[PDB]
Short mmCIF file of C-alpha atoms (C1' of nucleotides) and ligand atoms in Angstrom, two decimals:
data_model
loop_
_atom_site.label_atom_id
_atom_site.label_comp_id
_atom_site.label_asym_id
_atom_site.label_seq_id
_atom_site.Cartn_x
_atom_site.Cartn_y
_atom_site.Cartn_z
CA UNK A 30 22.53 -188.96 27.32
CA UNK A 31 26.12 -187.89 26.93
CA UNK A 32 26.85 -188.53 30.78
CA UNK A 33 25.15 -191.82 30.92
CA UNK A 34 26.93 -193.42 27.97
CA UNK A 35 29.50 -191.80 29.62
CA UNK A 36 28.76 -193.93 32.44
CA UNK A 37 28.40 -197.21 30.75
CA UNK A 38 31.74 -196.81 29.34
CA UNK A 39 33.12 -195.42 32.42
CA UNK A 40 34.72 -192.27 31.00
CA UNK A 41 34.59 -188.66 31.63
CA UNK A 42 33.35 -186.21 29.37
CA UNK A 43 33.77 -182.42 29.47
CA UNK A 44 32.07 -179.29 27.94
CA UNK A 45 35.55 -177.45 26.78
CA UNK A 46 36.36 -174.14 25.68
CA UNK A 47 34.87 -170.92 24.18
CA UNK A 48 31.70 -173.14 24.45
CA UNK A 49 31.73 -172.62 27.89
CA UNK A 50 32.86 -169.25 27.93
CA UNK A 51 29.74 -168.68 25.67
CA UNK A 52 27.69 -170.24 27.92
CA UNK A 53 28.64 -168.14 30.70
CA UNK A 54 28.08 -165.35 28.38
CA UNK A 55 24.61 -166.05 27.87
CA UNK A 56 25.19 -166.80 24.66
CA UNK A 57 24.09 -169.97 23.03
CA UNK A 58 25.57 -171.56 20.34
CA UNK A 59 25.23 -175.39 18.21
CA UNK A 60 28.52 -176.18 18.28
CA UNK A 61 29.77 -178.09 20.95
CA UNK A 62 33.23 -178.77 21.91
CA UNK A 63 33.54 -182.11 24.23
CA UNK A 64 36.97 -183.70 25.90
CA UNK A 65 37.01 -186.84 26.47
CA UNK A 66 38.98 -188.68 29.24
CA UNK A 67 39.10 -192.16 27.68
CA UNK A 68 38.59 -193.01 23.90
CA UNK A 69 36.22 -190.21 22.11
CA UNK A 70 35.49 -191.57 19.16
CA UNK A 71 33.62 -194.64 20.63
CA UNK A 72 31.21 -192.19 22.64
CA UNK A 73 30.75 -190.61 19.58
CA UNK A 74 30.02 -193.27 17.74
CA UNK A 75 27.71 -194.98 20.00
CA UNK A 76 25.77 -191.27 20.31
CA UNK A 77 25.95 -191.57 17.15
CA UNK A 78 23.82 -195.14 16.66
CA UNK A 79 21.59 -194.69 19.74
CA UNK A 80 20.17 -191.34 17.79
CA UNK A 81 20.45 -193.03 14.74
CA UNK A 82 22.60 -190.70 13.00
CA UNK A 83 25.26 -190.78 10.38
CA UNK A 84 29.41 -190.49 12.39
CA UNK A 85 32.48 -188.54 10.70
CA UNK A 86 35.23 -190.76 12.79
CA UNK A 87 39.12 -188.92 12.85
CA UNK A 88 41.30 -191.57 13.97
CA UNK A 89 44.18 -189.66 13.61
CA UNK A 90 43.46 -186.87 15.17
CA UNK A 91 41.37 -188.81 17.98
CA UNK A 92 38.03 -187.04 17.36
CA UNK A 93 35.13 -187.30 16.01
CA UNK A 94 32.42 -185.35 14.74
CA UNK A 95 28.05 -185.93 14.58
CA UNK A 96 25.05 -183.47 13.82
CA UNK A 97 21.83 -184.05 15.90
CA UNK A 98 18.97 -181.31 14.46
CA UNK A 99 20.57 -178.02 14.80
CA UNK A 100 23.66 -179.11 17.31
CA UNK A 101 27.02 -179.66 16.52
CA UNK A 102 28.64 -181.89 18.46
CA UNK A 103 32.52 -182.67 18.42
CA UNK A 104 34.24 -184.90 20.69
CA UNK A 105 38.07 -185.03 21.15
CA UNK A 106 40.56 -187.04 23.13
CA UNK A 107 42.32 -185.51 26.28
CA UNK A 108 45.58 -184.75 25.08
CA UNK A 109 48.72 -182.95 26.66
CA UNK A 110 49.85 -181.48 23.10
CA UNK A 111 49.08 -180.06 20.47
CA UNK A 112 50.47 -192.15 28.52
CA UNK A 113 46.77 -190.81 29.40
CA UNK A 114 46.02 -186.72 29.41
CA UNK A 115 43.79 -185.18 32.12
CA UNK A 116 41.58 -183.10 31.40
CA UNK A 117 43.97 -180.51 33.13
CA UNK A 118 46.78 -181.12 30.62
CA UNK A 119 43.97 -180.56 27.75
CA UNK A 120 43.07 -177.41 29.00
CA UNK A 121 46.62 -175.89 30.13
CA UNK A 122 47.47 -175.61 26.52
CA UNK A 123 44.75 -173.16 25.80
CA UNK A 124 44.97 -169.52 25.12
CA UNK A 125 43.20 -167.97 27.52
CA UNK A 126 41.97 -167.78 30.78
CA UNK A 127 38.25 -167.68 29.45
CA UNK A 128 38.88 -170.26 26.98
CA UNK A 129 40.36 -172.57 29.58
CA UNK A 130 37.68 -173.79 31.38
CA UNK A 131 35.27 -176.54 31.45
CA UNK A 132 31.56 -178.17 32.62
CA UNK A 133 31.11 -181.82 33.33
CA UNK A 134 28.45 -183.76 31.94
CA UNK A 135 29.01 -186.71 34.00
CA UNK A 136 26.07 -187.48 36.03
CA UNK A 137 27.33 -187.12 39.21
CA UNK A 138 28.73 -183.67 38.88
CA UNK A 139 26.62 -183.03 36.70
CA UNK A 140 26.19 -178.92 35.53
CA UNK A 141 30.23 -178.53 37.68
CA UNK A 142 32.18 -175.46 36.27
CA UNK A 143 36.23 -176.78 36.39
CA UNK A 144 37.68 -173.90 36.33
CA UNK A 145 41.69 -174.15 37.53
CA UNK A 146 43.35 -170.73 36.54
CA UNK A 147 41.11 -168.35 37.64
CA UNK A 148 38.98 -168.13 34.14
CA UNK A 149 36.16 -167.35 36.07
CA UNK A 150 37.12 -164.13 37.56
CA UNK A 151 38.98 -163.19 34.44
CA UNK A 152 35.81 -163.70 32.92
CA UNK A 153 34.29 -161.75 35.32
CA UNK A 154 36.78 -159.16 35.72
CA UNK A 155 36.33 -158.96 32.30
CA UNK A 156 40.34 -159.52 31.34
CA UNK A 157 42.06 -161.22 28.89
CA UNK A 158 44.71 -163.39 29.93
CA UNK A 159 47.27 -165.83 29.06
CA UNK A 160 47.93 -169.02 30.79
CA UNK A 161 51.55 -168.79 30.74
CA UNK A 162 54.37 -166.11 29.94
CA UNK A 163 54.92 -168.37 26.19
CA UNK A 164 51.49 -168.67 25.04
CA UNK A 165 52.34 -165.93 22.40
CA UNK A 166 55.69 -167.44 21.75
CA UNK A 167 54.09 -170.92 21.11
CA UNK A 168 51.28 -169.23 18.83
CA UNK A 169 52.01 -165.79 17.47
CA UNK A 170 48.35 -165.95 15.73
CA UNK A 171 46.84 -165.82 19.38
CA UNK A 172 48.29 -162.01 19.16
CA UNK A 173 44.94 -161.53 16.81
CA UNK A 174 42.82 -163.36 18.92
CA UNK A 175 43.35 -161.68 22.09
CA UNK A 176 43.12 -158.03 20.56
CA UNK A 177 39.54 -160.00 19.17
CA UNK A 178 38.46 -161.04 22.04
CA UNK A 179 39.02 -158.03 23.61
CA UNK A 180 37.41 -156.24 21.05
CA UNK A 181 34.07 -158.75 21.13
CA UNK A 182 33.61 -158.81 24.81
CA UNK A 183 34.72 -155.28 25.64
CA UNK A 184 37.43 -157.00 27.69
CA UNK A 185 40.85 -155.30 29.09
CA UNK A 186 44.93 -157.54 28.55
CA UNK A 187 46.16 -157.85 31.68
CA UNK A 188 49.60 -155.74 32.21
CA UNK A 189 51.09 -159.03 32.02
CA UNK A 190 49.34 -160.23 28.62
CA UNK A 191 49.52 -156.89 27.57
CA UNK A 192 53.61 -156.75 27.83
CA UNK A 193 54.28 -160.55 26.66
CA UNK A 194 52.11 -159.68 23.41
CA UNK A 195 54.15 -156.30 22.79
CA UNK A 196 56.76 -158.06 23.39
CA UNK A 197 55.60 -160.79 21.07
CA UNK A 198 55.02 -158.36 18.13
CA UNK A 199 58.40 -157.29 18.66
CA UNK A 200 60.52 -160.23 17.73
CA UNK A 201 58.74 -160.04 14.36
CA UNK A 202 56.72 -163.55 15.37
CA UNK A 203 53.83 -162.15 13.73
CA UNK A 204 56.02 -162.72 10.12
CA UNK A 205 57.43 -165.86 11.27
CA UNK A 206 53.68 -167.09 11.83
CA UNK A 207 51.80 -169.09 8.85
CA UNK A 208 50.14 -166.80 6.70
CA UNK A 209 47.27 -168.59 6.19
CA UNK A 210 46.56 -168.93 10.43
CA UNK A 211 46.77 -165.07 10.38
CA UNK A 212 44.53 -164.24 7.50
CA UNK A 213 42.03 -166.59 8.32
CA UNK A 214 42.03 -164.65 11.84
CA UNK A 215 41.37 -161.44 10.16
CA UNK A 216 38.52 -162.84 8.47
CA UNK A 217 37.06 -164.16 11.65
CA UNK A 218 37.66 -160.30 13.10
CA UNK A 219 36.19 -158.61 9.86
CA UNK A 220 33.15 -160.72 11.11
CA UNK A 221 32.69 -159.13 14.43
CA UNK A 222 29.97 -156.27 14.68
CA UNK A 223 32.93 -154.61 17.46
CA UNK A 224 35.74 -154.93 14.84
CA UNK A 225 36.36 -151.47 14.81
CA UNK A 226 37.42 -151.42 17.99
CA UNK A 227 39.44 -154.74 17.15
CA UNK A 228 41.09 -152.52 14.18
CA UNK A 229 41.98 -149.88 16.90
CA UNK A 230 43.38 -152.32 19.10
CA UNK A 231 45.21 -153.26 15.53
CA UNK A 232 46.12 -149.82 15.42
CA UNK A 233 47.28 -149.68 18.86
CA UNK A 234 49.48 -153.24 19.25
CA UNK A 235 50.38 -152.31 15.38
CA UNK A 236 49.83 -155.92 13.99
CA UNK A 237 49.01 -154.37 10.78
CA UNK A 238 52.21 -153.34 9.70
CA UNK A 239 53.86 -156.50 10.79
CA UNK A 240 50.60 -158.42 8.12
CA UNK A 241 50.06 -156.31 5.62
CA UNK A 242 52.98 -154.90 3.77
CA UNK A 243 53.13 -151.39 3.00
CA UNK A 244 50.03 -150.49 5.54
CA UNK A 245 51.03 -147.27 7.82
CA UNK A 246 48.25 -145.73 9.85
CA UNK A 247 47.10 -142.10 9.23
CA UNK A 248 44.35 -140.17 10.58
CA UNK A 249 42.57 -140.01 7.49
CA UNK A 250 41.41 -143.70 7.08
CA UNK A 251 40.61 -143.63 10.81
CA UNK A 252 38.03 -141.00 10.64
CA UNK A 253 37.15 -142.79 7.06
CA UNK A 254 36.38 -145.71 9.46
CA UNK A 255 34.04 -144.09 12.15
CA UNK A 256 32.43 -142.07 9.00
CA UNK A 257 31.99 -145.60 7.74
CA UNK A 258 30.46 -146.46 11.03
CA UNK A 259 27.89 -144.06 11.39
CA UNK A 260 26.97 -145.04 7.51
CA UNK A 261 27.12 -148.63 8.72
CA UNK A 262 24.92 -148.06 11.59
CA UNK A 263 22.16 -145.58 9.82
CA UNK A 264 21.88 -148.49 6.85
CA UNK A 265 21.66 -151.32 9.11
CA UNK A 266 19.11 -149.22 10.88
CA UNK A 267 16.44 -148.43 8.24
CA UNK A 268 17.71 -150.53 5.32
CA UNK A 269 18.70 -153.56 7.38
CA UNK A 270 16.31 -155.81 5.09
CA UNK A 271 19.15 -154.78 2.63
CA UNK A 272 22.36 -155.81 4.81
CA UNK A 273 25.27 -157.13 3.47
CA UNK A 274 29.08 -157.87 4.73
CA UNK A 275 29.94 -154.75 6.47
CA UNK A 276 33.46 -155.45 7.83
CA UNK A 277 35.27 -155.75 4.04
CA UNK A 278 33.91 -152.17 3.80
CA UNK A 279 36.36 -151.69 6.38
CA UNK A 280 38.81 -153.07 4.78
CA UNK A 281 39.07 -151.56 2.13
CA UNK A 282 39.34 -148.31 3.80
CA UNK A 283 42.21 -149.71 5.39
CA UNK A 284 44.11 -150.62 2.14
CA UNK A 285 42.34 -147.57 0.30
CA UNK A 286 46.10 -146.35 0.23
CA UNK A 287 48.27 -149.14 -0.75
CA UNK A 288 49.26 -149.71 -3.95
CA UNK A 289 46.58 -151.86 -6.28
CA UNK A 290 49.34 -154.92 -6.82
CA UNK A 291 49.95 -155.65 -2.71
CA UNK A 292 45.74 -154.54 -2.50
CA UNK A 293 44.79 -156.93 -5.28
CA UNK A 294 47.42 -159.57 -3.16
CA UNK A 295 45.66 -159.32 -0.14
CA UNK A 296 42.39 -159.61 -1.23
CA UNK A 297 43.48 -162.37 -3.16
CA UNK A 298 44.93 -164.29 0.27
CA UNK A 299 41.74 -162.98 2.06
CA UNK A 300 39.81 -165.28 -0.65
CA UNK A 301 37.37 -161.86 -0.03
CA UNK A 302 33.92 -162.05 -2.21
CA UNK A 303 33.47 -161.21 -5.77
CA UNK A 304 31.60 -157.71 -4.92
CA UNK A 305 34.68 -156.91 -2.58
CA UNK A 306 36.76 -157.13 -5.33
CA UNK A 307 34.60 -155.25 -7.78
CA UNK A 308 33.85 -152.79 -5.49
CA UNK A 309 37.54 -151.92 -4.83
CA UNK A 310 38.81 -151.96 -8.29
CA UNK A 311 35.98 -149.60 -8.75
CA UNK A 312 37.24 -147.53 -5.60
CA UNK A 313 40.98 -147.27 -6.88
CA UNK A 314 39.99 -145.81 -10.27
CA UNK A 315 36.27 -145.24 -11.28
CA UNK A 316 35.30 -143.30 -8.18
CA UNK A 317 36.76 -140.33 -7.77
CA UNK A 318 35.19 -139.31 -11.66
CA UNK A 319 32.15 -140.79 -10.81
CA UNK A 320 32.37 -138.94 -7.28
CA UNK A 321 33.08 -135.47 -10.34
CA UNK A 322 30.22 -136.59 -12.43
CA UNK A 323 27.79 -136.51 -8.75
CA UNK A 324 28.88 -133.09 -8.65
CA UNK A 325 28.31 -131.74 -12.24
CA UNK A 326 24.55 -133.79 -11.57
CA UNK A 327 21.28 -131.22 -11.82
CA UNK A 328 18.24 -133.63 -13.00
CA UNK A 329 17.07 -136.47 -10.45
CA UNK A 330 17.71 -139.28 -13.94
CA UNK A 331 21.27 -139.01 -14.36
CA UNK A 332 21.70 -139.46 -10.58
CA UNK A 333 20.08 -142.12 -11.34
CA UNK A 334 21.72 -143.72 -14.42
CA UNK A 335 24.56 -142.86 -12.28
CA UNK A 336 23.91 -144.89 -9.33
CA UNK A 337 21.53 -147.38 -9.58
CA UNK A 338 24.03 -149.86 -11.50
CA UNK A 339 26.43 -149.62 -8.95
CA UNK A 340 26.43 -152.23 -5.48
CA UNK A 341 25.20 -151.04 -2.65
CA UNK A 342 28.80 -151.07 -1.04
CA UNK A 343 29.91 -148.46 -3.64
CA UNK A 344 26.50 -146.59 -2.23
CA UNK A 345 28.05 -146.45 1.15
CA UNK A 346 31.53 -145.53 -0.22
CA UNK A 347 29.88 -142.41 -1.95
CA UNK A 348 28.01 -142.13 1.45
CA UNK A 349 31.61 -140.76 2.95
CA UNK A 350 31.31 -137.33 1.04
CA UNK A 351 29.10 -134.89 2.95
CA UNK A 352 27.88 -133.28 -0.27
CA UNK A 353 26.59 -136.53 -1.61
CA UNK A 354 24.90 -138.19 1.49
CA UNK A 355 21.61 -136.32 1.20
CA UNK A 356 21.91 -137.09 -2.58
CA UNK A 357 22.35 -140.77 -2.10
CA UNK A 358 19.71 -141.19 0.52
CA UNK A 359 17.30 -139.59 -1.32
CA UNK A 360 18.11 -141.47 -4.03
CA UNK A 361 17.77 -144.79 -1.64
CA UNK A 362 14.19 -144.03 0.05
CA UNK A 363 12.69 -141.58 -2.49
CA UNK A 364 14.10 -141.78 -6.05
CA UNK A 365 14.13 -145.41 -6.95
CA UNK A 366 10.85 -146.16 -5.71
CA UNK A 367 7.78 -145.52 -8.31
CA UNK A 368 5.48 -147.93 -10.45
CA UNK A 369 2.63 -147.69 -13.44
CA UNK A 370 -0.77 -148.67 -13.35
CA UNK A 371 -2.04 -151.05 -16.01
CA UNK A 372 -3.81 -149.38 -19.06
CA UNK A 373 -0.79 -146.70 -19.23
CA UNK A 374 1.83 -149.27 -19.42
CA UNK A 375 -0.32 -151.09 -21.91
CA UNK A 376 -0.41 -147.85 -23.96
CA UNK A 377 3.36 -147.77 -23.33
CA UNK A 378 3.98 -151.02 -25.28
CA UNK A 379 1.88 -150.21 -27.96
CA UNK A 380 12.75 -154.81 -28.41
CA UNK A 381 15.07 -152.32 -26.60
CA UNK A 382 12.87 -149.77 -27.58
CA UNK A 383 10.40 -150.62 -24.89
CA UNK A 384 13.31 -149.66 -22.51
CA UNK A 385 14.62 -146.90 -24.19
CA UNK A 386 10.93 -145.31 -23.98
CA UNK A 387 10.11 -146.34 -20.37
CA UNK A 388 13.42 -144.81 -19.14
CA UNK A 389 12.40 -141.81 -21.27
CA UNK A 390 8.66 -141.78 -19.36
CA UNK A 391 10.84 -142.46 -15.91
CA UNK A 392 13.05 -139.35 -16.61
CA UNK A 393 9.76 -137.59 -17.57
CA UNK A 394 8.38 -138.39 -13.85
CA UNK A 395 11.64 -137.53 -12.32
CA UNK A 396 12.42 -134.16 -13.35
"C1'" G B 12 33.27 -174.22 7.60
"C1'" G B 13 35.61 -169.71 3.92
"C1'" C B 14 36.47 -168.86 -1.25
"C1'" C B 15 37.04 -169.66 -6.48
"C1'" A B 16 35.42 -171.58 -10.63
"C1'" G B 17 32.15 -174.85 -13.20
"C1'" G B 18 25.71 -176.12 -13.65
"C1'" U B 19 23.48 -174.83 -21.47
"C1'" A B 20 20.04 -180.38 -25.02
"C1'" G B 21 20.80 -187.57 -24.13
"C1'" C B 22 26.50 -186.45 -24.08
"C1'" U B 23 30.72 -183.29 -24.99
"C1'" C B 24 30.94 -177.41 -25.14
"C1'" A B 25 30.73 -171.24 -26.41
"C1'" G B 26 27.23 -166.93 -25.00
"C1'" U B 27 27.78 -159.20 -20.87
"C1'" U B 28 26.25 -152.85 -22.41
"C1'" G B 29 18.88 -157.04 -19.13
"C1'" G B 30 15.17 -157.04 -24.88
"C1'" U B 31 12.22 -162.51 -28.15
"C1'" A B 32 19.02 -168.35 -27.69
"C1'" G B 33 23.39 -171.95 -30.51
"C1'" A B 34 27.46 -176.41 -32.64
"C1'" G B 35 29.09 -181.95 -33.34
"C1'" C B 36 26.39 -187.04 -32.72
"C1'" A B 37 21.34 -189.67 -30.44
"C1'" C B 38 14.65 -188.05 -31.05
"C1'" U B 39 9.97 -188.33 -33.45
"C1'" G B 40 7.43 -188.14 -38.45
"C1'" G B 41 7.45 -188.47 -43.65
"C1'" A B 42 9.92 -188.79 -48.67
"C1'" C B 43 13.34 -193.42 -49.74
"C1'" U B 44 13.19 -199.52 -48.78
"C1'" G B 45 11.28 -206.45 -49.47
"C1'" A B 46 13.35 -205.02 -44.30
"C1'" A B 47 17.20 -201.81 -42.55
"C1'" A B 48 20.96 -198.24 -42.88
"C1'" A B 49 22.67 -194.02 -45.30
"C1'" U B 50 20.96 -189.50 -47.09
"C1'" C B 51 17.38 -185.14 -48.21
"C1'" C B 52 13.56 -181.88 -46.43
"C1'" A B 53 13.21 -180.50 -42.12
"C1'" G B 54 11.97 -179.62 -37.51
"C1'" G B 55 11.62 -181.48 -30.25
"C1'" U B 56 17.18 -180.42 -29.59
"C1'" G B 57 16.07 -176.02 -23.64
"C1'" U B 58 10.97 -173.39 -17.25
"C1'" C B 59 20.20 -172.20 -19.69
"C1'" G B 60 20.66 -175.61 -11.01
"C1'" G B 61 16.38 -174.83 -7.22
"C1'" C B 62 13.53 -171.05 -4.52
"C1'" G B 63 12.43 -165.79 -3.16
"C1'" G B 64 13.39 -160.56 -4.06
"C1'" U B 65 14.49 -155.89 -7.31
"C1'" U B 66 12.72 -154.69 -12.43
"C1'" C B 67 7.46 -153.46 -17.28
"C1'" G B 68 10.68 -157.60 -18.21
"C1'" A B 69 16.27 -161.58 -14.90
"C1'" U B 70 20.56 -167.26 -17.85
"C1'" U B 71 22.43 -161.60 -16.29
"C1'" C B 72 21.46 -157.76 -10.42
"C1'" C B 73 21.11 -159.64 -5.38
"C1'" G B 74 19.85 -163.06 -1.31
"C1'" C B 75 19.01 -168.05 0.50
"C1'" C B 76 19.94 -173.25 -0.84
"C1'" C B 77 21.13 -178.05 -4.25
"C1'" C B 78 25.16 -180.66 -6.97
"C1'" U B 79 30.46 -181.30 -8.70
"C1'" G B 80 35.71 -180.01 -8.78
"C1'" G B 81 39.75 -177.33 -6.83
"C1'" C B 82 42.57 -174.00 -3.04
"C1'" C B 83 42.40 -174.23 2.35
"C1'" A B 84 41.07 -173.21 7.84
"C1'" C B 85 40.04 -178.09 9.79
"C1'" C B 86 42.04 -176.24 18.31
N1 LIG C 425 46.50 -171.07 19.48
C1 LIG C 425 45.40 -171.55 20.12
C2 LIG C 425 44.20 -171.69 19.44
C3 LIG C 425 43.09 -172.19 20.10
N2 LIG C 425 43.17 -172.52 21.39
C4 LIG C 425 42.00 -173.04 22.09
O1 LIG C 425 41.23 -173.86 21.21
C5 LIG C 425 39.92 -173.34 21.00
C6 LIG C 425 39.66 -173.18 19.51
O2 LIG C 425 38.27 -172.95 19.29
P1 LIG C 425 37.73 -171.48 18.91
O3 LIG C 425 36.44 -171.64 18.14
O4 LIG C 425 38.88 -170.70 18.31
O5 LIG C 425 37.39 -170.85 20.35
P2 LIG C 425 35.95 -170.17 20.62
O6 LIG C 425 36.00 -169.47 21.96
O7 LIG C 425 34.88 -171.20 20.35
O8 LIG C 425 35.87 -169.04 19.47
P3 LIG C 425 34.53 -168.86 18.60
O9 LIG C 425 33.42 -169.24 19.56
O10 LIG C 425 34.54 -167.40 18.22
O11 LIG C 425 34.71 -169.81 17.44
C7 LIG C 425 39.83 -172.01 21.73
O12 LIG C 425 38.70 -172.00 22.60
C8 LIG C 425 41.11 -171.89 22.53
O13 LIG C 425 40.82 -171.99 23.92
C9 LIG C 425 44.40 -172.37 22.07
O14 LIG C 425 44.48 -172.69 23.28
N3 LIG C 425 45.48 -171.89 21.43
#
RNA sequence: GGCCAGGUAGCUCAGUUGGUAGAGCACUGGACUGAAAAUCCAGGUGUCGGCGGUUCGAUUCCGCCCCUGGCCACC
């Protein structure tokens, strides 16, 4: 319907972006990102009334945004920067390659890829490249992105990408950058099921120590990260009904070593969740004597009383020892899991006391 | 869209080792009155957002959502 409004209005509208890229990908998403060659907002609109839905208008900005069931749809004005734009011009001042091409919904091209630097071999080349030798220059945050993208779609920087971004990184743009940009990246790459191999390209381009202040790189934390991996991948395997934000486990490997004040700092400009936090002021201080108290542990009920207030992410933290993984996954599929018929527990309640004497008849079934 | 609070009576507000809920003014009924108010005895002041899950038991632990306010990312 898109392409024949389009028509009435005799404009020309565009599928734009990583929405494309996606969709050469296979992968299918419900957010949709449209240029428009002509007014936007007036397509949108009108799509808007003919499905008779509500319109969130952006004059200022020249685009507009609807919801029709599950899609997304946005639709933005051709425009040169960030006199008429082409389409072109819109694209040009993209990132990438990938991220630079397009697919026209106008009828009479209908399903056309425009692709005009090459995206589509870089695509299939699988290479991640920049349009021209400035793109970091004009947005150091794109330094993130790349290593990201390269990370999600097992993709390869060009030698030329590859040596503007190095170079990039070392006229300290990375600190000139707004923070906020940056650490909103990093939450988008804590996200990614492939961030580890984002956090060695990280590790590799050495973004880290330009963001994070204080962070240096040991071998300790890295083998603490593929540890964490395996531990990651065995609990999303036969747990995964119990699956929660993996990648801040990561991260807090990574600042495992920093001091709590720049820790507490970062968390606090990653806006990260309230069992992030808990679980790493826990990790600072609390562990390593509750990690002494798993060792001094005989009966099956103070494993217990030991472990079953605790998060699962603190779970996974204690999964890093080698002594205590067979400890904590028996305590996972074995320990915690028991019940009581009726007439016992009826006998059982003949306050507080109730609990005091059912832990008592637990630790009696334990051990 | 991410996060942080806030969600407790009609309104304005506190509450952690899960274990049988509170204040100031409106609400009913009676004692009181020619009627009413005040006041006394008292007692509703509540599935402590909604729905699942864990637990013998959840305002509390967790997950998914609703509402309001504030920080932002809003290519
Ligand atoms: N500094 C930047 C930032 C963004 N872009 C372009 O603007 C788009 C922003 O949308 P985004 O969601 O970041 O791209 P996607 O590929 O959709 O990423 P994702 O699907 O993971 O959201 C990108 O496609 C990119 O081509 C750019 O050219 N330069």
């Amino acid at each position: 319907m898109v392409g024949q409004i389009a028509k009435e209005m005799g404009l020309r509208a565009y599928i734009v972006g990583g929405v494309v890229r996606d969709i050469l990908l296979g992968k299918e998403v419900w957010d949709v990102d449209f240029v428009v060659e002509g007014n936007a907002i007036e397509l949108a609109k009108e799509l808007a009334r003919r499905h008779g839905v509500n319109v969130h208008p952006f004059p200022e900005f020249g685009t507009a945004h609807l919801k029709i069931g599950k899609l997304k749809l946005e639709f933005a004005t051709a425009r040169r920067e960030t006199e008429p734009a082409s389409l072109k011009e819109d694209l040009i001042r993209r990132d990438f390659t990938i991220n630079a091409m397009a697919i026209s919904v106008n009828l009479e091209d209908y399903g056309t890829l425009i692709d005009y630097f090459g995206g589509l071999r870089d695509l299939k080349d699988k290479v991640i490249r920049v349009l021209h030798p400035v793109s970091f220059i004009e947005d150091p945050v794109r330094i993130l992105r790349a290593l990201r993208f390269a990370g999600r779609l097992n993709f390869k920087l060009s030698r030329s990408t590859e040596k503007l971004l190095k170079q990039a990184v070392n006229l300290g743009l990375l600190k000139e950058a707004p923070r906020g940009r940056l650490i909103n990246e990093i939450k988008l790459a804590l996200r990614e099921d492939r961030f580890l191999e984002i956090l060695e390209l990280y590790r590799k381009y050495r973004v880290l120590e330009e963001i994070i202040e204080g962070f240096q790189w040991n071998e300790k934390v890295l083998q603490k990260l593929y540890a964490l991996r395996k531990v990651v991948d065995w609990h999303a395997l036969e747990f995964s009904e119990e699956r929660i934000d993996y990648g801040w486990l990561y991260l807090l490997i990574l600042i495992s070593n920093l001091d709590y004040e720049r820790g507490k700092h970062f968390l606090e400009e990653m806006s990260a969740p309230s069992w992030v936090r808990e679980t790493y002021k826990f990790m600072k201080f609390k562990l390593g004597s509750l990690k002494e108290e798993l060792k001094k542990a005989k009966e099956n009920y103070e494993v217990y009383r030991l472990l079953k207030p605790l998060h699962t992410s603190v779970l996974l933290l204690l999964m890093l020892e080698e002594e205590l993984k067979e400890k904590i996954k028996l305590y996972l599929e074995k320990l915690r899991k028991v019940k009581l018929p009726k007439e016992k527990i009826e006998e059982l309640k003949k306050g507080k006391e109730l609990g005091e004497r059912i832990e008592e008849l637990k630790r009696e079934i334990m051990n």
